[PDB]
Amino acid sequence: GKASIHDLALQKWTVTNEYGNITVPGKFPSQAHLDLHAAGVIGESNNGLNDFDLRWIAAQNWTYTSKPISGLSKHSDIATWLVFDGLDTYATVKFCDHIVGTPDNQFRQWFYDVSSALASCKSDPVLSINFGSVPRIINAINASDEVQHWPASVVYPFEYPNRQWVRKEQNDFGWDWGPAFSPVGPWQPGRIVQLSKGGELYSLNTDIDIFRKGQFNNFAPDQTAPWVVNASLDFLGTLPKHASMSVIITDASVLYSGKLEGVTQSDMTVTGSVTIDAHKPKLWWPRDMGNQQLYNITVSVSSAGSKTPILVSQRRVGFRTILFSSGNITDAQIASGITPGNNWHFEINGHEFYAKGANLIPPDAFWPRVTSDRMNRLFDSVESQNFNMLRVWSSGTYLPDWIYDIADERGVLLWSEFQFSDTLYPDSDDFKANVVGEITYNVRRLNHHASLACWMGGNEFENLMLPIAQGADPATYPYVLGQYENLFITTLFNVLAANSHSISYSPCSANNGWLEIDLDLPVPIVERYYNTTSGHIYGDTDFYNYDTSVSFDTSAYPVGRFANEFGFISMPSIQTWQQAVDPEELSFNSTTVILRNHHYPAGGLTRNIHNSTLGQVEMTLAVERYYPTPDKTDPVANFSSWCHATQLFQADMYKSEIQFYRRGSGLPERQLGSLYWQLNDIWQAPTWAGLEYDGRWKVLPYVSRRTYEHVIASAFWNYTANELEIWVTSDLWEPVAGEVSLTWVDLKGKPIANNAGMTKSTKFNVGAINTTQIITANIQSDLKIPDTSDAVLVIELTAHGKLPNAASSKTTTFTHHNHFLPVWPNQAKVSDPKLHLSYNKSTKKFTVEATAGVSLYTWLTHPAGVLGFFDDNAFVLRPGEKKEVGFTLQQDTTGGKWTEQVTVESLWDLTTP
Amino acid sequence: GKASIHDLALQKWTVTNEYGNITVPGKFPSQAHLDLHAAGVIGESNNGLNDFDLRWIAAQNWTYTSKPISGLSKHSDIATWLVFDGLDTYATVKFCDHIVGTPDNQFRQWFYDVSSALASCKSDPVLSINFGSVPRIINAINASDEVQHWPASVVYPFEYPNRQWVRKEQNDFGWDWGPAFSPVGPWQPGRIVQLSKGGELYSLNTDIDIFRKGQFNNFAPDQTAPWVVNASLDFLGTLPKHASMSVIITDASVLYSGKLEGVTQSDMTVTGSVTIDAHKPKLWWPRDMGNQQLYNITVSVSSAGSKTPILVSQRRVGFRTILFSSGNITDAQIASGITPGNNWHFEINGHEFYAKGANLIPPDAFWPRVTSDRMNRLFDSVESQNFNMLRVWSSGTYLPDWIYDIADERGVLLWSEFQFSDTLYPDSDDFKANVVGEITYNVRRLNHHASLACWMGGNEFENLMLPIAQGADPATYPYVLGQYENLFITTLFNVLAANSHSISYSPCSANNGWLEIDLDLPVPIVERYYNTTSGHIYGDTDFYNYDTSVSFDTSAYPVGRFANEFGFISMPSIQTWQQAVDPEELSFNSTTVILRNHHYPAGGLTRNIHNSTLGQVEMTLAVERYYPTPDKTDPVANFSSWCHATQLFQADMYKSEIQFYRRGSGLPERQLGSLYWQLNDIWQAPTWAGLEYDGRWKVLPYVSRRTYEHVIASAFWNYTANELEIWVTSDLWEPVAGEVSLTWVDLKGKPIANNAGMTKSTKFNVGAINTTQIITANIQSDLKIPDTSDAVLVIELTAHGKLPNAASSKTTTFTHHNHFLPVWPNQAKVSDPKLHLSYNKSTKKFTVEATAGVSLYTWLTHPAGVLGFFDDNAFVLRPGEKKEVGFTLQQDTTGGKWTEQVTVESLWDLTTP
């Protein structure tokens, strides 16, 4: 009596529009833009001005229709279900011409009993799914005077208005780094399940919660306590009374084989738990903190009398604790010298760590075409930059299991969020009920992933949208604050706590922490909000100061506990532009390039050249103020070269912020995180990304890689006081010692006399997760530099130590390269360094040599036909010094000839015709 | 009392669509596609699948509206005219809200008296021109059962149907090498003319006819007779009775200053003539036949009593006779050994010459954007290929004066045609009246150009469309034949003869000649048609055999008097593709590349993949049968390389035809012309062009240049009999002597023993415009080639002689390079020739060297940022031999760095991964 399953992917689909005049072959899973492009009705959606030209698609219905489905049993002993892991979004499902369901949530698994439709069916049943125009439906919802309305500043759009009314990925209606395609379709897998009486059940969803005994959300657990493994299984259809549960936990070697205890059951769910000795399971750690130990847990449900299980579920899991700590700074912390206020940090298995990484946005406007290969390449680039965390930004979406799997096994912590973002939302009973379906399904679905690090209720509420709402409508503000608490704390925190003991919570991405957490309270998390004291420090920080005159001025950076967002936009490579835009449109300010800059966004549906131009201007001023301004005679080389200068400014600014945040680990703030805005791009356009749509590295990720190294030497320049400081900062969990060499040369590479009055070398000791000051110098009073525009300081650090939980006693050697230029890059008197470049096919290394003088911001550019990244880039090179640079080849289309097309350049080349 | 003129270009224009929802800035002259693209409403019309996607434009009206026009006098002593040199096509002209005209001919100058509209105007007048949707209007015309209809095979479309009903450039509705944009707008210049009573007149158009006294159309004039200069001037408005005319003719040094005699006048025209001694004017000749002597003739019209002229007109003219000879082969010609029948050749100033060139199609789908620079570059490429003639193909259009000017001064003969093409046409009274406006205006306008070489009534009537009509509807055929004669002979020949004594005529582009020409006959040209005799030869030839198994088989080529059309399609360069199509679409058979191949055309409005694919297949089979078939690992290099093989096949086939046509000059046919199909491209697509849209040379023009040299040595291979013949052919007007070296080597460059049994060198004598056989050899019986797949024969000719009408006694040296391969290129055992390439900035030469062996089809490719052509390309190179190759730089965008981006390759490179 096994469950009979027809995968909807193997069925045959046709897609039709609303007006009866467009019919093309369909795919499942897909969305209509993708099936239209596949048939040649449209060009690649990311191209040209398609954000405008393709709006006829979002404005109408699309229907996915199967051919008659064969092979279903028509015996009435049998229950026939439709199971949909994702439908995007408002849809009308029909089976043999009967409306069987009307789904309205992208983020929910839907299931419908079609037994009776099948029975009435005079031939093989056709399944059809009629997907609405989302703008039209949300416009119709909003137009009613019977629903909630908010001030214009609170619901101000990017492109389409009214997004707060639909449980759909919010960026689908446009964002300040992406287009507004509002795609629809069967966006995740789906199938038909036929279940026979007294037979096998079907598994819908499985919540595995591995926690320390006594553990609660948001509180540090007892690391000496036994593990509790709790398993709760959702299913279709009939589980008999007095059901029993057993589990086998094996190395992903049996850890445990046993029965579960305290079994409970209801109509569609069965739950049990088991306790395991603290000494048995090996711990999961993030990358560079130990092993990524995982286990397979298979859970079987049997029924009194039955020889064999009728429900079996398997997940891959880890044994670890991950705490997000946002409560008060303790007396103990205060006496240690930490500024009072509220924490904002993470702990893994009881250990504090410095978080290093970025914000992950959706890699594509069409989730169905996002591949395993594409996401594996992206994770390679994340590891290589020395990340241990991504913030999975809201709102794109809840990531599919397969993406958390990648994180799990590589050791990247995923700070996760519910899909609510940069606006205020409804809190009627029906909207909430829909949200609760969503929060309950996804919290349960995702809970077993070792990479999952926290849940936050949504993006930018207490730090941005709530105070906008207070300002915009003071009289109604306490009402909208109550809805916030009611939805994001009372409903949502209770839902998470009901389904997880292991994952901590915050009602939004940035806030001043909590005063109390207690489920006995009507609002179980009592937020601090603005109940603050002068001198105290709370919360994580943002930094988006676009005034280019203070960009490198550390007195303008925020003093906080964790930096979860910060950035400036930059152009992508010309090779990236070349993917999406016409050759004649390749200039800094062409109409198409400007219209693709959504910084700043249109605020609606117009072609807003003015707002886009504001971003164009920010980049232009940044370059003009700090970097040589290209003036290349070939207009193509001029565009390419201007694109690269914008990237240099972004890299250097992020470096400047990251080293300041990291040093803060050892100052009274005790800063413990850096997540730059933003890791990646959704299309080809000027943004905050470090990784372009296809994966190509900007200058940023090469610089952040170095600046995210375990042990770094960092140069801090107070340019008003003309004072230089060099600090050494380490994220290791034990003290380390080492040395930094400090070599002053002119831009031809000749040493400056007496090393400009500075020591050639100095030793250091630095505490665990801490910093130490090793040099201070007034450039005019204490150093003797004959010409500051003909000077560079080359900094090399070496240190010895162990990574956390290292097995081997053999100590690792840590090295960091850096430089300090006592003027702005545009003031440096660089000359042609006469770079030589060659490739060695045996060693697979490029050799780069400066022959005539010092090269600044040396830069290798791989060609179009290849994907990957170099082991270093944007570096200082002195003549005679030979540098070897390898490349991680992820994909090659050039049959190996790409090595001959690689080029090298430096700052000098920005200045030539 | 001077004429007051407002140029409509300096007025301010707005363009609006039919439905009130599109408004953009306008230009005059322009067309709506161009003004829409300029405003960013659409992308470049030539891009992607815009032939489909842009059809919403042709389907509706576009209105060009001025701002209120200032500065017109409102005195009723004054006549105010609108003068339009071209409006495309059906339009409604309004002036101060009054319909003043409804033009319906692209090819006519329209003028309208708006004096009364101006007088009623309560403020400054607005001029508006509402342009129709042409498809809609011709569909409406055709739908009426009151108009003529033809069999489907006769009016079979390319894309839009019904084109026979509109006097508009026929290719605007699509052709088998171009798109169907059906553009509309003020496509040529226009202005407002205010004329005061008793003042200056305004010149509309001026017919200058310089002929030999007694000369008539189509008959060889007397070269010893005096020149008659006839000047007929069209004007607005009032010329008083008893007007007089004088002329000054000056070097373009007075040739003549005098009065005109036999003056006649009517309402809008004044005419007079003057006779000049045969000894006074220096003659105009085509390029490489003498000087391009031109003169300025200024004609003034004065009135009894008036001190100064009231009408002045200036044209640039030449003194020469050009005969198109299509009458019977004379007894004299027969006794000389020429096959009987009818001639088809040209004579310049009484001398026969061999015509060499190609068919010129419109360079752009939008005539307004065609520039002087663009057409100058095209004429450079024409001269460089050794052309002396272009056939200005119908139907595109009647060329503007400025293009004939370029031809005039460079010496390129322009065989010109009336705009009727590849279908049969109406012959109602209104249609004819419209045509007569057209033929009369353009014949008069163009007559003074020395480059003008003939008028033919239209393309493909008697050789194609008439026999299709006889086959398709035998009963109605005599009726449609009568309309043909009535329109294209009775009406049109009379109209030309009324306005020109100097320019010969043919009722269509290809026919068997005439039996009689006599204006006393009801049909003044009595066509031979099919009144033929076995063994006799008539007419010019076409050749479009697409069966690749006979392409190089000279027994399949047509034996005629002149070859006016012949070809095979080939892909353009990848750099050309890259202009118009997405990167992902760059493969031989992508959907976009296939859809842009209009060989074969859709036959209507569908996306006809099947018909397009037939052309794709022709090119594929051609390559597979004869040339190495690329299999490059990089898909981009694979596409590029497949594009180049198609070009090699086209070049070699044209060479094979041209040398066969030219040799025919000395055989009983006495062949006297080669015009290959086609010179140039209207957009980026696989076609018969030798010059791609932007001007880039295919392989074809490099090969035809050599094959159009004055003196050539040509290899004829009968591959069934395995016989080689080498002939020397000369187009000079006097005998020449010289020598040809014949060097047999293997593909490493080592001589074959005893030169394979062939003489190393041989002398020749060749008659004026004639040929001589210098070698015959059976490859197996008479030669000793150890391995025919490891053999090449390198042929170099040198000769001494004079070009026609050369002043200097110093004789010119003529050299021609060629080769013979005794197997097909795909059978040749080529090895890596190890080519070296360098550039010398002082000499501006590239040096090309084969280091390791013989290189076949050596090929330099200039990069994207530069326009021009090399002085040689696609050549055989033997090792040690150094070849220098210069480049005519027409435009550079790369600031001189393009020389470093030039690459070289050979046949060998098609075969590598």
Ligand SMILES: *[C@@H]1O[C@H](CO)[C@@H](O[C@@H]2O[C@H](CO)[C@@H](O[C@@H]3O[C@H](CO[C@H]4O[C@H](CO[C@H]5O[C@H](CO)[C@@H](O)[C@H](O)[C@@H]5O[C@H]5O[C@H](CO)[C@@H](O)[C@H](O)[C@@H]5O)[C@@H](O)[C@H](O[C@H]5O[C@H](CO)[C@@H](O)[C@H](O)[C@@H]5O[C@H]5O[C@H](CO)[C@@H](O)[C@H](O)[C@@H]5O)[C@@H]4O)[C@@H](O)[C@H](O[C@H]4O[C@H](CO)[C@@H](O)[C@H](O)[C@@H]4O[C@H]4O[C@H](CO)[C@@H](O)[C@H](O)[C@@H]4O[C@H]4O[C@H](CO)[C@@H](O)[C@H](O)[C@@H]4O)[C@@H]3O)[C@H](O)[C@H]2NC(C)=O)[C@H](O)[C@H]1NC(C)=O
């Ligand atoms: C392992 O794990 C698990 C998980 O997995 C766990 O379990 C858990 O637990 C928790 C705790 O307790 C809980 O929670 C809770 O909940 C509730 C509700 O409930 C309900 O619902 C639910 C849900 O459902 C859903 O889902 C599911 C799953 O999947 C399924 O099954 C179903 O079907 C459904 O589904 C649906 O829906 C959804 C949405 O929702 C969607 O998604 C889907 O699709 C569909 O549609 C459930 O679950 C439940 O259940 C249960 O119950 C029943 C009876 O009733 C049974 O039958 C069953 O079997 C079960 O049982 C279990 O549980 C229970 C409890 O509940 C117990 O008793 C038993 O024993 C067993 O175990 C139902 O149906 C809610 O309501 C709650 O809340 C409350 O509480 C809290 C604490 O806890 C607090 O805080 C809050 O606030 C509240 O309270 C309040 O109210 C109340 C009344 O209502 C009262 O009493 C109190 O007092 C209070 O009040 C107060 O205060 C206020 C203010 O503050 C004032 O005003 C007033 O006046 C006063 O004063 C909670 O949350 C859950 O539920 C569970 N789950 C399960 C599955 O089971 C376990 O535990 C673990 N283990 C270890 C060892 O650890």
Ligand SMILES: *[C@@H]1O[C@H](CO)[C@@H](O[C@@H]2O[C@H](CO)[C@@H](O[C@@H]3O[C@H](CO[C@H]4O[C@H](CO[C@H]5O[C@H](CO)[C@@H](O)[C@H](O)[C@@H]5O[C@H]5O[C@H](CO)[C@@H](O)[C@H](O)[C@@H]5O)[C@@H](O)[C@H](O)[C@@H]4O)[C@@H](O)[C@H](O[C@H]4O[C@H](CO)[C@@H](O)[C@H](O)[C@@H]4O[C@H]4O[C@H](CO)[C@@H](O)[C@H](O)[C@@H]4O)[C@@H]3O)[C@H](O)[C@H]2NC(C)=O)[C@H](O)[C@H]1NC(C)=O
């Ligand atoms: C384009 O796509 C869209 C989306 O797919 C299509 O719109 C959808 O059309 C279907 C079929 O008509 C509807 O389902 C049927 O609903 C009726 C009830 O009708 C009322 O309810 C609707 C309310 O819609 C909501 O959205 C509106 C905006 O459009 C908004 O203004 C309104 O306030 C509602 O919004 C609230 O609720 C939303 C959740 O629904 C929520 O997200 C919002 O936030 C908000 O809170 C109105 O459109 C309509 O005018 C009426 O007011 C119902 O009677 C039908 O019931 C049948 O099916 C169910 C199972 O689903 C079954 O239990 C019943 O017994 C019954 O079955 C029997 O009848 C069938 C035939 O009717 C028969 O086939 C069957 O065999 C049985 O015999 C059904 O549920 C969707 O509600 C609607 N969705 C929308 C609007 O979002 C649209 O038609 C497409 N257009 C084209 C041209 O193709």
Ligand code: NA
């Ligand atoms: Na209010």
